[PDB]
Structures are given as structure tokens and as C-alpha cells.
Amino acid sequence: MQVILLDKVANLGSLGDQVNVKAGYARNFLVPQGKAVPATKKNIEFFEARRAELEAKLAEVLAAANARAEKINALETVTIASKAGDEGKLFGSIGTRDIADAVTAAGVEVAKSEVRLPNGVLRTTGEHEVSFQVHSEVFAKVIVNVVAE
Amino acid sequence: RKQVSDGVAHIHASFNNTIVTITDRQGNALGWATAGGSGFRGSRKSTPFAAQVAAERCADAVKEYGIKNLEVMVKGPGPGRESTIRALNAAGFRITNITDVTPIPHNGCRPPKKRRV
Amino acid sequence: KVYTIDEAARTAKFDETVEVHAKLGIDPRRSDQNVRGTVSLPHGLGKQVRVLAIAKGEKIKEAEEAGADYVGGEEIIQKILDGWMDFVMGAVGSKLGRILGPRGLNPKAGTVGFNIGEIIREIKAGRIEFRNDKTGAIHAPVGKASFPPEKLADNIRAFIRALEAHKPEGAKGTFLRSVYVTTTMGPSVR
Amino acid sequence: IKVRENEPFDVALRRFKRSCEKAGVLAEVRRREFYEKPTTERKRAKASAVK
Amino acid sequence: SRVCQVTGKRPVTGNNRSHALNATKRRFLPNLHSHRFWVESEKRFVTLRVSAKGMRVIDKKGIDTVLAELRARGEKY
RNA sequence: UUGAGCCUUGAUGUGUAGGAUAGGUGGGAGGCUUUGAAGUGUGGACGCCAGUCUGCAUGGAGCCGACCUUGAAAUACCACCCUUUAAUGUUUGAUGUUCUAACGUUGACCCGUAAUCCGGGUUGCGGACAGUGUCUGGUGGGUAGUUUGACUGGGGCGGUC
RNA sequence: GUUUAUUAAAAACACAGCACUGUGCAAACACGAAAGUGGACGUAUACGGUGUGACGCCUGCCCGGUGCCGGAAGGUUAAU
Ligand SMILES: [Mg+2]
Ligand SMILES: [Mg+2]
Ligand SMILES: [Mg+2]
Ligand SMILES: [Mg+2]
Ligand SMILES: [Mg+2]
Ligand SMILES: [Mg+2]
Ligand SMILES: [Mg+2]
Ligand SMILES: [Mg+2]
């Protein structure tokens, strides 16, 4: 038969292709342990609706889990009111829920665990930098400036 | 194909004919030759000569794994029992250690009868 | 390629040394290996011969200019008969055989002509172009082909030299053209 | 039976073979059984070997 | 009795025509085989005595529609 | 990955007048190898142990052709390759190796069940074999239906048609 | 011992014994389109088929033919 697959399936499958398999394999193994299904045409278009949706649509929505950072370099500077000891060296210090909570709390809304201040993370005043995370490949840089007020 | 260099030349010398077999240490047959195989039949093959010329042929057949030094195991009576080890020394051979392996029952099987000739 | 990459000879000095060595069927029954008369090959090629025909004492002043360089004489029928290192070709027809001037005892040279009115006729071109190719051992067609002077222009033989496919034996598959020599080797298909 | 015979000499040097096997116990076993007739045979190996 | 529960195929009679055209009444049995089928919609194996053609029908219509026919004519399975 | 179709990358031959182990005819009066050779020395090796070959190598700078014979002349070079072999393939089955999940279980167990049937379940053992359907070659007096002539000084034999 | 109830009681059949030969058990084999069942609640010191016929002394030669058994390379050879 033809049959269209479900899971990845070894030396033939893919995850949602239209392979062609010996019926002995389809009945008796694949379809029963629902790893595939009869290509009843009714189905093959059940799959064409499933060829437009999740893919074409929700990847220009991860073009929004990405263009969040088109507003990461268009400000590129938050200040933290953290002072300085005996020579312009932070009396404060700012981490991730300091650089995600002092990022969210404006027009820059990020998820608190989306702010990589590799440690410096942090131990002095003035300008620093950080690695802001929204996508797996597209993060983005800013500039942070712990203001000694 | 394959290679050795350290070997063993087995010989089966027996009144009617003598047979040379050349194998490695772990006796896995590298090359053989027989007194009949060469020519001579009848008396002919049952001769030290005919055994020399088998001992020889055998070299041009086991030189095909470039053997250098090899022990010698001598079984049975009859010619070719020593004339073979001569044609071997010469053939182009370091000839390591010689041993005689002719079997000797502590009197077991009744041997054949007769030979009212 | 679809025909041949006639650009298949890019060192000897003059790669004309090419041959027509095609394939034919088998002898499962009754068939033979023959060639017609001087197969010319639709291509000037560029071959000036020394064609040897057996005319007489009149065909020496016009039976020698027509793609050749001479003709055997009347005194030299057996007065050229005293050596093996001394001596196309020919043998006139109608009612004339030539075993008294080519017979018993290892060379082939049949095609010359047969005219009862001329030695060089008003329209008779086609002799001195290409050789023969009868029976051999495992097939036939051996001879010559194009040259180092053409391009795909000596592939005039490709459509009227490979097209010499006359009835194949029976249990066979005659069809495969090949040539070349003095550089590499090969052939396309049929 | 066995000969090492290390370095210098391509001579066989196996005269040990004429010290036991070979036509020894091998001409012996080669043929006619015997059975009691060796008795007679060895009664000449001593009817001689007396002098 | 040698019947395919899908198609109804059962033995039919006919002839064995020899080379001399002698007819001898024979039968043609169907290619029956009892076979266990996974019904997903029943978390259960339903085994049908089926002809090979039978199977091919089940592979196309689908065991649910097919059992659904048996059910619809009290052919209990 | 074994026995067959077949196709690129290569071998190869003691009939006489003879420098000498001529496959049949064909291109043929100069290619080439310093992209580093003739044969000395051992390597795989076909074997009529008569001789051939080269990846490699020690090598290190020319050999020859119509020459005079022979029904057929160049190991000068090239190939369509026959005497018959040999090295990958292509897939394809094929012999093959497992697997388990169809299928067998006339092992064990559980439930319906106070049941040597049957069904379902669990397990163990097999396993795409076995078995069965259709088709098909062989075998098949086991069964079956028949045939096995007429003339004839009765019939049969013989003979005849 | 058996047998032709009703023209044959026998030298015929059986018989212990013997030999071949099949059968590893879901046995061969047999009754059964089949399920099921005999064989057997047995298991090769068993079970089936075949012949011979206590016992004593013995049972030679022949494998061309016909049967059967084994064989795998060739040849021939079905559906496909
Ligand atoms: Mg009958
Ligand atoms: Mg009558
Ligand atoms: Mg009585
Ligand atoms: Mg009575
Ligand atoms: Mg009476
Ligand atoms: Mg019995
Ligand atoms: Mg009797
Ligand atoms: Mg007898």
C-alpha cells in the first residue's frame, strides 16, 4: 500500500511522509502500533490541511520570538540605581531577575530566564553588557549601566 | 596473499611414495607436493630422487608466502625420508630444527598378515 | 552522446588512423560476412590510391586516371611472375575470370569494374574512397573511417556507414559502432 | 628423534634416527603379526649371541 | 464451515477437465485463514476466519467498517 | 553476500624453409618513455614445473620496418576481441544471518468453570518455516469408466482383410 | 486351534518362532472433505506393513531386467 506515517519510523519513514509499504508490514506492525496509516485519500488531504498550518504560520511567529530583539538594540541601555564603594565600584550588583525584571518593567518585555549576565554577573559600576535570550539561535546584545545615585 | 617466514616442512615418507607438505607453525597447510604428483610411477615414484623433485616443486609453491626458516618433521620409512631435507636445505632455506614423528604403537592393532611372495 | 562526440581525438601527429569496427549478429543457422564493391563512405576523406586492374594494351592512357596510379600490363601477366618480394586492385568481368592472375598459393583485392565502352566513363566516381571488410574470426566490418581533418564532418559516415545494417543472422543483436586509434580508445552507441 | 642443531652446520647430523625408530620398531610392526615365532626368532638372537 | 466472514466466499463446484475433456466434479475452496486483527476502537483482538480477498477488503474498508457489517447482520464476532 | 544474465578497467597462443613460444584478419612507414624503460633480484601467480606478466623495485638513456623465406610479418603502436579464465557492479532474487509481529504449539499456567471440550488471557517453545488455498509438472489398478475387430466347414490357434 | 452356516475340515488359514522393512511420537498407519478418533493413556526390548512358519542342520551364485533406495554435475523438463 501507500500509507502515510506518524512517528519517525526507521529505514523508510520521516514523521509525516507518504511512503509505500508491503501490506504485511502495515497490518501486523505499523498501523496497529499506530506508526502509520492507510493513505485513504480522505486522509492524504487531512494532511494537506496539516501542510499549511503549524509550519508556514508559527515560524513567522518565531519571527516574533526574534523581533522582540529588534527592540533589544533600539534602546540598548537600561540603568540600575546601584551606587559605588571606595572608588566607583558597585555598592549594588545586578543579575538576571535584575536584568530581566529591570528589562520587563518598561517597553522591553522579556521572560525572567532570558537574560544572560554571564556572572559579572556582577561586581562593579558603570557600563557592562549581557546576552538576551528569546529564541534558541537569535538572542541579542544590549548595554547595561549601573548608575551610582 | 598473506605471509609467514617462520615455518614447518612436514613429510610423509612411505615405501610406495613420499609426500611433502609445508605449513606454518600452527600447521595450516601452506603448500604440498607428492612424488607421484611430479611424474614417475611404479618403482619410479618410490625413490629418493622422485622425492627430491617433489621437495623441490614444493618450494616453488610455498616460496609464495616467502618462508625463510622452518623446522622439519619426518614421518615413515622409505626413500625421500632424508633426500627431501637435502633438496630443502638447498632450495633456499635456513632449516631450523629436525624431528622424527613416525608413529609407534605400544603394540595395539594387529597388523596385516602375509606376504607369501 | 546521442550520435557521437566527434570531438573524441584531442598526440600521435595525424589522428586519421581510425577504423570502422562495428558489431553484427552470430551464425545460428546460415548467414555470411561480405562487402559490396569498394564501399566509398559519404566523405571525401582524402585517399589517393594505386589501384591495380587487369585491362590490356589499350587501357594505359585513360584507364589509369580515375582515383588510382597505374594498371597491370599485357606482358606483365606472368612477366611480373618471378618473385614474392617483387609482386585497391581489379579483375574485369562479363565472361572473364582471373584465376590465371590471382588464385592458389593471402590478400584481398576484388573491386575494379567492368566496362564494354570506356576505361574512364562519363560518370563513374566511388572507387578510391574506402576499403573492404569481409569475414575475419568473431565478426566483420574492419577497415577505416574519419580523420584529423573534419570535426563532426567525418560523421557523414555516422549516418551512411553505420546505416549499412543488412539483415542480421538470427538469434543476435547487431548494433554497435566504434573507432579511434593513437591517443585513447572508445565508441558511443547504435 | 629431535635435533636442535643451532648455528654452524647444514649437515643433517641426525644419526639419532639410527638409534631407535626407523627400521627398528617400524620394520617390526610393518607386517606379519608373528605371535609366537618371535620366540623362535629371538631364540636365534641368543643362540647366536652366546658366541 | 469454509466460509469467509468478510466476503461470503465459500466452496463452489465445477469440473476437472482432463486433456481428453473428461469432466469430474470438483470443488474450489477459498483461501481461508483465521487471523487476529487489532481493533483499536475495542482495545481487543477480534479474530476472523477470512479469505485472502477478505483481508484485502479489510485493508481497504478498515476493520471497523467491516466488523460494522458483520454487526449489521448479526454475524457475531 | 554464494551459482547466472551481461558491461567498463586487463590477459593470451612449443604446424616447416627462420635473427624466434607467427590467434584470424584490419588502421600502419614512426609512436613514444624522463607522467622516470630493456632484465638482472625476489614478491602475488596462471602451470603441458616449456615459459609468460607486472603495482613495486636494483636499474639509467634507444630498440628497429619492406630487409633474403612463408598459402598468412611484426612484441613498431592500436583494438572489434575468438581459443578460456580472472578482479568491483546492478539489482535481483539466491543459498545465507538474525529478529518477532503474522502463523503453529497435541508445554506450563490463569479465568469463564466444581469441565482432559471450547474461548480469552499470561507465559514458554517455535516462526515467516511449517501448514493451507489457487495454479502447476511427476506419481498414482487405490478407485473409476470403458476398449480389447470380423471371416472361419463350431470356436480357438494358424491364415486372411 | 481355524475354515467354505447348506456337496470341500483339508496338505488350505492361523500359530509360537524367524527376516525384512517403515515409524522420534502431533509416530508410521488407519477411519474421517473436516473437526475428532484408533495406533496408545503406548514411545524403538514399542508400534505398523510384508513375507516365512516349532524345532534340528542349514539357507550358495546372479542387481542385466522389474521394483525399490541413494546421488548430484550435466542434459531434458511445468505453471510462472
Ligand atoms: Mg478397472
Ligand atoms: Mg467371429
Ligand atoms: Mg485338530
Ligand atoms: Mg459344507
Ligand atoms: Mg464335510
Ligand atoms: Mg513387528
Ligand atoms: Mg506358506
Ligand atoms: Mg537366497
Side-chain angles (χ1 to χ4, degrees), chain C residues 53-56 58-59 62-63 66 90-91 93 113 117:
Chain C
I54 187 221
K56 315 187 173 173
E58 310 173 279
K59 284 352 176 187
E62 252 243 27

Side-chain angles (χ1 to χ4, degrees), chain C residues 1-78 83 90-91 93 97 101-102 104 107 109-110 113 117 125-126 136-137 140-141 143 145 148-149 153 158 162 165 168 170-171 173 186-187:
Chain C
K1 278 285 213 155
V2 175
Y3 5 77
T4 57
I5 285 225
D6 300 284
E7 182 199 328
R10 82 203 106 153
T11 179
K13 191 81 64 47
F14 244 87
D15 283 270
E16 325 176 48
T17 177
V18 294
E19 306 145 53
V20 171
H21 286 201
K23 278 268 64 62
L24 21 157
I26 309 181
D27 288 56
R29 276 165 22 196
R30 293 249 190 167
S31 60
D32 63 340
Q33 292 131 343
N34 279 287
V35 164
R36 306 295 174 180
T38 45
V39 176
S40 353
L41 197 295
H43 193 13
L45 292 183
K47 316 298 180 183
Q48 183 79 41
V49 236
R50 302 169 184 167
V51 187
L52 175 263
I54 187 221
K56 315 187 173 173
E58 310 173 279
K59 284 352 176 187
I60 313 291
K61 308 161 195 162
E62 252 243 27
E64 279 173 15
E65 277 193 1
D69 112 317
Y70 249 141
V71 146
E74 266 186 323
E75 288 89 43
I76 4 183
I77 291 282
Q78 296 196 46

Side-chain angles (χ1 to χ4, degrees), chain D residues 9-47:
Chain D
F9 47 4
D10 280 27
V11 47
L13 308 157
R14 210 154 43 88
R15 301 70 231 259
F16 196 9
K17 288 318 85 221
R18 306 316 185 255
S19 182
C20 25
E21 298 186 283
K22 240 272 101 185
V25 266
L26 188 145
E28 197 181 349
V29 171
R30 174 143 164 263
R31 200 222 130 199
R32 202 198 192 135
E33 209 258 305
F34 266 154
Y35 203 107
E36 176 92 27
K37 141 167 48 148
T39 23
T40 84
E41 202 184 27
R42 279 70 156 173
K43 212 152 284 107
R44 191 95 316 184
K46 229 69 177 241

Side-chain angles (χ1 to χ4, degrees), chain B residues 2-10 21-31 65 67 69-71 73:
Chain B
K2 267 277 285 166
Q3 164 69 13
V4 42
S5 72
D6 208 335
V8 181
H10 298 289
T21 256
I22 286 248
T23 188
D24 64 34
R25 311 297 305 280
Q26 63 262 2
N28 294 282
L30 303 169
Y65 302 143
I67 322 184
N69 42 263
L70 83 178
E71 292 94 301
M73 319 230 79

Side-chain angles (χ1 to χ4, degrees), chain A residues 11-111:
Chain A
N11 309 52
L12 72 118
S14 86
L15 251 325
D17 281 17
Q18 184 172 342
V19 294
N20 166 268
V21 58
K22 307 191 208 182
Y25 193 28
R27 117 187 91 237
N28 288 2
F29 184 77
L30 301 177
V31 191
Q33 295 174 21
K35 297 227 193 73
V37 72
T40 69
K41 295 155 185 167
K42 164 182 182 174
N43 299 33
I44 78 180
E45 271 148 356
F46 180 116
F47 258 65
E48 252 301 347
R50 207 75 40 258
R51 279 281 154 238
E53 285 221 4
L54 203 278
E55 311 158 346
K57 80 184 197 176
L58 292 196
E60 70 239 350
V61 176
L62 83 72
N66 239 269
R68 255 166 271 193
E70 221 160 2
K71 324 177 69 186
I72 271 180
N73 307 273
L75 183 223
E76 96 214 61
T77 229
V78 187
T79 261
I80 286 101
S82 152
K83 332 237 183 288
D86 220 85
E87 180 45 49
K89 208 166 194 175
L90 226 49
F91 241 124
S93 45
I94 286 291
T96 73
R97 297 164 201 175
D98 303 272
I99 299 176
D101 294 15
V103 156
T104 45
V108 202
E109 288 207 355
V110 67

